[PDB]
Amino acid sequence: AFHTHSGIGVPLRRSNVDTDQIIPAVFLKRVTRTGFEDGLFAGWRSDPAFVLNLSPFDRGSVLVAGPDFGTGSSREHAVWALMDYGFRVVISSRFGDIFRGNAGKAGLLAAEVAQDDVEILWKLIEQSPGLEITANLQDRIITAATVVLPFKID
Numbered sequence: 001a002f003h004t005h006s007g008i009g010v011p012l013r014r015s016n017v018d019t020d021q022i023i024p025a026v027f028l029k030r031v032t033r034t035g036f037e038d039g040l041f042a043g044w045r046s047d048p049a050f051v052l053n054l055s056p057f058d059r060g061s062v063l064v065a066g067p068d069f070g071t072g073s074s075r076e077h078a079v080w081a082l083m084d085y086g087f088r089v090v091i092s093s094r095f096g097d098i099f100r101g102n103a104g105k106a107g108l109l110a111a112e113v114a115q116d117d118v119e120i121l122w123k124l125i126e127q128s129p130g131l132e133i134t135a136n137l138q139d140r141i142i143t144a145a146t147v148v149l150p151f152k153i154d
Contacts, residue, residue: 002109002137005088007061009125009133009144012051017065018072019099023081035084036077054129062089062133064121070099070110079106089135091142091151093118104153109135111142111151120147 014021027039044050051057063082069092070078079102082090090108093115103110113121124145125131133144135151142149 002088002107002135004134004136004138005061005109006132006134007086007088008056008059009062009064009121009131010051010057010060011122011125012063012065013122015066016068016071019070019074019078019096020072022070022078023075027081028075028077036081037084037086040081040085056130059086061086062091062135063087064091064118064125064133066118067093067115068096069094070096070103072096072099074098074102076102076106079103079108083108089133091118091121091133091135109137109153111135111153113142113149113151117142117149120149 023036023039024042027036041052045052069090074096083106089111091111091113095110100110121144131144133142135142140151142151
């Protein structure tokens with residue numbers, strides 16, 4: 001039951017991020033009493049330069065990603081891993097269909113935004129890391145700094 005979220009935006013310039021990149025399959029069988037926060041993007045997180053390792057993106061809760069986010073006959077767990085880490089909004093110019101449905105059910109907003117608009121968001125948050133992005137479901141807008149960009153959920 002999403003309604004409105006404001007949080008630190010995270011610029012992930014990766015395209016075709018599949019569900020095995022979001023949550024590698026080994027994590028589905030590794031004992032954990034909290035959730036999958038430590039498996040989220042675990043393959044990329046070993047590199048200190050990876051965006052989520054950078055402060056303040058580490059505490060981010062709005063993910064701004066490249067095209068085709070969550071391709072790969074999803075697992076509910078990919079959405080759940082994003083949420084466990086703290087994300088409540090993911091922005092992309094196109095989502096995997098099954099990921100999309102899972103995101104809605106779980107309360108993760110999958111906001112579809114035109115690629116040129118995604119670019120605007122990337123630049124803003126790269127230029128001022130820590131910049132908050134706000135998603136408003138009722139009005140269907142993403143706002144950040146002095147920009148107000150339209151999104152769809154279908």
